Symmetry: D2
Subunit: 251 residues, 4 copies
């Protein structure tokens, strides 16, 4: 407890699923949190479900919107003071092979999944460096940052990009003594209402040939590794990949 | 010799440097080759320097140009018959940290380095599958597909994307018995006229803390691994990463 | 706090350095701990420095001693009840290239660094499986489990072995629903009294070409990732590699 | 053709399967070859099946026998002149989980699979360095050097050790300008008479969840990557891992 004392976090796609669990555990550990999402009705309800406005607020934002990133950092500083912590979690999927990926699908996925993490990481470095905040940028990749899936071509591209781009940012921040760390988190299959809405998905993901543990994870599994990475407990971790996948990538 | 008997190869950025060496060794090994480049004066001279038009021709193309990919495959089939082999080699660099990367620089680099490889891989699968060609797509990544460089943020993103996207394509092609392989090649530092034009670059690259062998490679070092991957010698290799880097990534 | 409620941990080489910090943070988080070491004078003093015998005790043991592993598990159960948690941390180094490694040096290093982790992991699975303990085996590898060092040949062999052997154990435990996780921790350079005793070592390790952060870590940097892995917070993490290295392996 | 002009190769376990195919393609490419094996009846027949004694000879040797390595290098120099090329291919498997691995099984597997590669690599560096031979040490790892198999615990340990130890040797040889390269080859499932003798094995290995290509490889698939690595074509490749696995590790 109080593991995130004084931390001020932005979590993109923080209104649902993994992002909401990260926001929930962040507030529990003493962080101030701004969550983002596309819909104000969902986002304001999600903030209120976690805590009071002195603990957590909502900011409506598409991670692909470059100018909106400026407004997001400005809104978070006004509410909570200087931002110490960014979780780039907002993401979309396309269920296509490379072969069957339309160019519009490709561009839209990379706008959210790659441009979003680039915009957030670039602005985060500028706003958080040289302030003694113990600043941490946590870029959400996935098992699809390590291994191919034949039906997630564009997604694989975006997750491989986030994985290695994050190492560039980590090195630059370390060599320049910016007091900013950059790490990637790589979830395997995680049970969310969205997974619950695709009949057969959880059973398919739970097969031993997919997830050796024979079941999928829960949003809190990703929340706890993010608390570690946001905390000063991980002050010697930068440029690293943290996998929580029930053994998916070990076989 | 005759290691590429009957193969028909497209090599993007085949008019200079690594691409020109791949084209040269491909023709030597019995492949028909279409090289691409931005300038007709350079490209036609480069084709003529390797062989006769019955062996190698030039096609003017920016790898970022989606519609031009169609014209490139059509031109290669008309000259040489069905394409068996694609080397996605065309690439550009931006010398910026993530922090100092302009959005226009970011978009332009990903247009050539990521869109280019996606357009080529997608069209290549469609044109080469189910024809018993022993088809091979060779996607040029680099050491920057494995490790960060603090001053190559966008480049790291593009090379990490190509690395993992290529595994998606490899798996889909394998599971569907397309008779198409997809592999990545990861050069370290290679001496080219372009490296020779940056004073101090070769010495910096040749430092033991960069390249343990204490010298950089030559274009033929990349040509020979590409001959292996284009040939039926590698018919059980797909979804794999082939590193030729003088030990850069081993330390 | 109370993050290791009810956990019973064995930590090999727990009387000094990283092992002592893991033991210290384990007790702080509510775990009962048995630390091992070669010397009773050091080990008993180390236990007393952390807490009372109801919290932490010492057991004299060489990790290479197969029969002594039985006595270690028996002693820990008698003191604390069923063992939930094993940290295989005991290790030695040889400062030789492969070329200059004597066979006796080779065998002795692999006896502690590889046999030790095998004996501990094998016995740990047998004693901890199917008991609803939320059991966790944490095998200490290092950056030398990922990358070569020209002067640590035998050490590289042992750390590469622990890295991949741990994935085998993880998969078997997951597929058989043993309620046992196996993960590896990969420290970079960590300041210890032993590092302080080699003049010039910390400066050499702190060079940007070695550790991008430009300084080395402290034992608590490894303690905190071990608390995460021992805790039920990591119940979906198995077969994974957790790197805490100041950016060493990111470049 | 003549890709191994003037090369003098030792191939351990060169009398059967993958080793025999490497020996066959080595002789075809102009290398002189000494193959090793346990039985003189098999070994002499295997040598004669490939070529004349001026091309290839047999030397009876257990790779775990340290003193016999000296006699092997002496016999090869006497027959063929200075050794340029070592393929550490001799290996055994144990079909046990870590949990079910007997200590005698463990020690015997590591004696052949790890001690063997260490003895060969150490002696090879000493005998081949500083002679302008374009010397190459090719250490046979496997897919089990990258990923766990729950029923190959000891094998995983040995293959992870060879993988990272080989990088140490590569770096030392590069930094000291020894004119010796060290690389690892990582076969997936390969059809051999031994695989043909285990009913159901090839079908199990050929499942899409194991080998995406839906079939296993043949010994020549490993022979061709070994020709590349032995040849001066790979003179900028050291400390690298070459995977030929039908997509096993890409998913
Ligand atoms: Mg896998
Ligand atoms: Mg490195």
């Amino acid at each position: 407890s109080n593991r995130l004392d004084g931390k001020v976090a932005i979590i993109t796609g923080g209104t649902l699923g993994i992002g909401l669990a990260i926001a929930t555990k962040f507030v529990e550990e003493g962080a101030k949190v701004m969550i983002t999402g596309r819909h104000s009705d969902v986002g304001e309800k999600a903030a209120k479900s976690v805590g009071t406005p002195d603990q957590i607020q909502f900011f409506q934002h598409d991670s692909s919107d470059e100018d909106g990133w400026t407004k997001l950092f400005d809104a978070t500083e006004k509410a909570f003071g200087p931002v110490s912590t960014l979780v780039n979690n907002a993401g979309i999927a396309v269920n296509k092979s490379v072969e069957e990926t339309e160019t519009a699908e490709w561009r839209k996925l990379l706008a959210v999944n790659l441009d979003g993490v680039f915009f957030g990481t670039r602005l985060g470095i500028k706003r958080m460096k040289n302030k003694g905040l113990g600043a941490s940028i946590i870029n959400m990749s996935s098992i699809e940052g390590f291994v191919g899936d034949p039906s997630l071509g564009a997604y694989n591209a975006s997750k491989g990009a986030v994985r290695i781009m994050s190492k560039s940012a980590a090195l630059d921040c370390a060599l320049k003594d910016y007091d900013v760390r950059v790490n990637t988190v790589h979830p395997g299959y995680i049970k969310t209402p969205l997974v619950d809405d695709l009949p057969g998905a959880e059973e398919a993901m739970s097969q031993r040939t997919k997830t050796p543990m024979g079941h999928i994870g829960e949003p809190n599994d990703i929340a706890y590794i993010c608390v570690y990475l946001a905390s000063n407990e991980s002050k010697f971790a930068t440029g690293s990949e943290f996998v929580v996948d029930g053994g998916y990538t070990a076989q």
